[PDB]
Amino acid sequence: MRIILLGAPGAGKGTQAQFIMEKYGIPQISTGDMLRAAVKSGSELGKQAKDIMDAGKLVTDELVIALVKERIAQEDCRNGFLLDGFPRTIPQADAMKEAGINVDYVLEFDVPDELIVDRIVGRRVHAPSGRVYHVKFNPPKVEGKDDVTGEELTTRKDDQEETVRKRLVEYHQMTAPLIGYYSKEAEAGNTKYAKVDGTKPVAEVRADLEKILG
Amino acid sequence: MRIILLGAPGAGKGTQAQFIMEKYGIPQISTGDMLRAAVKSGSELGKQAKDIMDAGKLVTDELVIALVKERIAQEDCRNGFLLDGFPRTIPQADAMKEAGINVDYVLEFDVPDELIVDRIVGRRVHAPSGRVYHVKFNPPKVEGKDDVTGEELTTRKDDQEETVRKRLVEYHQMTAPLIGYYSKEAEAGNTKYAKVDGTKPVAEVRADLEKILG
């Protein structure tokens, strides 16, 4: 089973990953890890990657596709793999197909921007420990306070409604054509594409995936 | 002892790094290493940087200076540090100053473009082993053939003359004003700048370094 899991930054698609790994006996792959690991164990590619990163340059799609084709080449990817958030663009998806890397399913985990904004802006944290609290969800037992230390909660620069709304627009303008690319690949019959309403309770999303994947 | 080590790609400034660490008891910090270390140790900035990398986004100067301030705060930098190839621009250098990160020395490891071009374009490699030869410097016994397998050698894409000469121009247009920035600073008495002839015997360069650093 080779699956591509797409979802907005903050949509919560990872919630369903452990489930997918445990059902199919496949590992989860992200290009970020993949890069950190290849540099570590100096291989040709990882040496090429390490150089670019050290020079403050962006890694070429050319390197990334080679590292993926290299990774999925292992024993652990015998049963398949769960590629988390890659590809990010059509040339990357195309480059994957040309190198013969095919996937059975492309799952788009869908949560509305308003709901993602909500899940994020209403988030408090105990600065000194990074302990998270969420005003509507998991509030601190003691309002505005760290149940443990007692010390008052702060908000992360990153969870600002403005910053959050910018990430989303960017994400959407980047991902829209890729989604269209996949839906047609599916119409073509080269893969299966599925949207997953991630607003549902986790147990229902899980049931939805079992129905979608077999 | 706080030293910034500058040098064109291919000049071999790394050759004198062990000496510097061994003489002053300071570590080598490079942004690629530092980044890859913030992520792992899920600290506030590390998390910020892990997402950026993972999203295939480029790390902003702002986040980079933050990792350097965090990093050099580690106890292993209690004697100073060797910052290898960073800053890369006046904007980056100026920010380090503003954050209170002063440096005693800025060394520019100098090796003429042509010599670097010659040191690189003329190298053949045995792909499935990584063995490297240089038509002039370390030719294979059977020229054009790998000595251990009797298998043909190749040239890396990077080693290509067109690619090499482009990297160097790119490097020079970018580093020319930084060098100039650091000389004005040196003249202002804020740091010491020194140019090192990297075309000398390693033993001579090392000798020179001691007469510059003490």
mmCIF file of N, CA, C and O in Angstrom, chain A residues 19 29 32-35 47-48 51 59 66 72 79 88 90 106-107 129 136-137 141 144 162 181 195 205 210:
data_model
loop_
_atom_site.group_PDB
_atom_site.id
_atom_site.type_symbol
_atom_site.label_atom_id
_atom_site.label_comp_id
_atom_site.label_asym_id
_atom_site.label_seq_id
_atom_site.Cartn_x
_atom_site.Cartn_y
_atom_site.Cartn_z
ATOM 1 N N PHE A 19 -2.905 4.842 12.576
ATOM 2 C CA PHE A 19 -3.933 3.901 12.177
ATOM 3 C C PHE A 19 -3.581 3.209 10.869
ATOM 4 O O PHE A 19 -3.732 1.990 10.733
ATOM 5 N N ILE A 29 6.636 8.403 5.873
ATOM 6 C CA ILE A 29 7.779 9.082 5.289
ATOM 7 C C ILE A 29 7.526 10.550 5.057
ATOM 8 O O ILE A 29 6.533 10.935 4.459
ATOM 9 N N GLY A 32 11.294 15.912 5.049
ATOM 10 C CA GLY A 32 12.108 16.590 6.036
ATOM 11 C C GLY A 32 12.983 15.603 6.800
ATOM 12 O O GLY A 32 14.183 15.803 6.922
ATOM 13 N N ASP A 33 12.392 14.525 7.307
ATOM 14 C CA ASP A 33 13.148 13.512 8.051
ATOM 15 C C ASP A 33 14.175 12.922 7.130
ATOM 16 O O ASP A 33 15.361 12.879 7.445
ATOM 17 N N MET A 34 13.664 12.460 5.995
ATOM 18 C CA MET A 34 14.411 11.842 4.904
ATOM 19 C C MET A 34 15.692 12.591 4.563
ATOM 20 O O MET A 34 16.709 11.981 4.245
ATOM 21 N N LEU A 35 15.617 13.916 4.586
ATOM 22 C CA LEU A 35 16.770 14.761 4.324
ATOM 23 C C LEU A 35 17.684 14.725 5.543
ATOM 24 O O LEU A 35 18.867 14.438 5.412
ATOM 25 N N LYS A 47 25.233 13.848 0.819
ATOM 26 C CA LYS A 47 26.394 14.721 0.765
ATOM 27 C C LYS A 47 26.002 15.891 -0.124
ATOM 28 O O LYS A 47 26.386 17.024 0.132
ATOM 29 N N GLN A 48 25.240 15.626 -1.175
ATOM 30 C CA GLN A 48 24.803 16.714 -2.030
ATOM 31 C C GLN A 48 23.805 17.589 -1.272
ATOM 32 O O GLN A 48 23.854 18.812 -1.363
ATOM 33 N N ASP A 51 25.412 19.882 1.569
ATOM 34 C CA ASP A 51 26.109 21.036 0.981
ATOM 35 C C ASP A 51 25.181 22.194 0.684
ATOM 36 O O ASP A 51 25.494 23.350 0.967
ATOM 37 N N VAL A 59 16.887 22.777 -1.361
ATOM 38 C CA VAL A 59 17.212 21.526 -2.014
ATOM 39 C C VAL A 59 16.400 21.382 -3.285
ATOM 40 O O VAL A 59 15.191 21.593 -3.304
ATOM 41 N N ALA A 66 15.238 11.804 -5.852
ATOM 42 C CA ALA A 66 16.241 10.737 -5.827
ATOM 43 C C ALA A 66 16.323 10.107 -4.434
ATOM 44 O O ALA A 66 16.494 8.887 -4.310
ATOM 45 N N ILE A 72 12.221 4.651 -0.439
ATOM 46 C CA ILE A 72 11.206 3.640 -0.689
ATOM 47 C C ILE A 72 11.813 2.350 -1.218
ATOM 48 O O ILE A 72 11.105 1.371 -1.498
ATOM 49 N N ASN A 79 6.067 -3.482 2.051
ATOM 50 C CA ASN A 79 4.595 -3.468 2.089
ATOM 51 C C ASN A 79 4.026 -2.170 1.535
ATOM 52 O O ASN A 79 2.823 -2.046 1.312
ATOM 53 N N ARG A 88 4.449 18.451 -3.127
ATOM 54 C CA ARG A 88 3.884 19.762 -2.832
ATOM 55 C C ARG A 88 3.509 20.510 -4.118
ATOM 56 O O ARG A 88 2.839 21.531 -4.050
ATOM 57 N N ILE A 90 2.951 20.198 -8.824
ATOM 58 C CA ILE A 90 2.799 19.312 -9.984
ATOM 59 C C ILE A 90 4.141 18.809 -10.556
ATOM 60 O O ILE A 90 4.260 17.650 -10.938
ATOM 61 N N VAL A 106 -4.367 8.817 -2.941
ATOM 62 C CA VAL A 106 -3.959 10.150 -2.598
ATOM 63 C C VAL A 106 -5.112 10.585 -1.726
ATOM 64 O O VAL A 106 -6.256 10.615 -2.170
ATOM 65 N N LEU A 107 -4.833 10.799 -0.452
ATOM 66 C CA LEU A 107 -5.875 11.175 0.486
ATOM 67 C C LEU A 107 -5.769 12.625 0.875
ATOM 68 O O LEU A 107 -4.750 13.056 1.402
ATOM 69 N N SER A 129 7.664 25.607 29.831
ATOM 70 C CA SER A 129 7.653 24.159 29.611
ATOM 71 C C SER A 129 7.069 23.766 28.263
ATOM 72 O O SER A 129 7.140 22.595 27.861
ATOM 73 N N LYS A 136 -11.197 26.345 24.383
ATOM 74 C CA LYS A 136 -12.483 25.713 24.156
ATOM 75 C C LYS A 136 -12.397 24.208 24.356
ATOM 76 O O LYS A 136 -13.341 23.582 24.836
ATOM 77 N N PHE A 137 -11.266 23.636 23.963
ATOM 78 C CA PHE A 137 -11.065 22.208 24.074
ATOM 79 C C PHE A 137 -10.588 21.931 25.471
ATOM 80 O O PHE A 137 -11.369 21.975 26.403
ATOM 81 N N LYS A 141 -7.195 23.777 34.052
ATOM 82 C CA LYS A 141 -8.125 23.648 35.172
ATOM 83 C C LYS A 141 -8.312 25.025 35.810
ATOM 84 O O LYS A 141 -9.432 25.452 36.092
ATOM 85 N N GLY A 144 -6.533 30.624 32.680
ATOM 86 C CA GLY A 144 -5.419 31.488 32.320
ATOM 87 C C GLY A 144 -4.141 31.105 33.043
ATOM 88 O O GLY A 144 -3.111 31.751 32.860
ATOM 89 N N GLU A 162 -3.283 36.074 12.134
ATOM 90 C CA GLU A 162 -2.760 36.630 10.886
ATOM 91 C C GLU A 162 -1.795 35.635 10.239
ATOM 92 O O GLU A 162 -1.974 35.234 9.086
ATOM 93 N N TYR A 181 -4.605 17.912 -10.397
ATOM 94 C CA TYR A 181 -3.733 16.987 -11.092
ATOM 95 C C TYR A 181 -4.102 15.555 -10.689
ATOM 96 O O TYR A 181 -4.293 14.688 -11.559
ATOM 97 N N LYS A 195 -11.162 12.457 -0.744
ATOM 98 C CA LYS A 195 -11.214 13.577 0.186
ATOM 99 C C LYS A 195 -11.761 12.963 1.474
ATOM 100 O O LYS A 195 -12.639 12.097 1.430
ATOM 101 N N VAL A 205 -13.668 9.017 11.152
ATOM 102 C CA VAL A 205 -12.688 9.225 10.086
ATOM 103 C C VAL A 205 -12.040 7.861 9.832
ATOM 104 O O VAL A 205 -11.944 7.385 8.703
ATOM 105 N N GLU A 210 -11.188 2.946 6.468
ATOM 106 C CA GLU A 210 -11.239 1.511 6.271
ATOM 107 C C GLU A 210 -12.101 1.228 5.069
ATOM 108 O O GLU A 210 -11.810 0.340 4.294
#
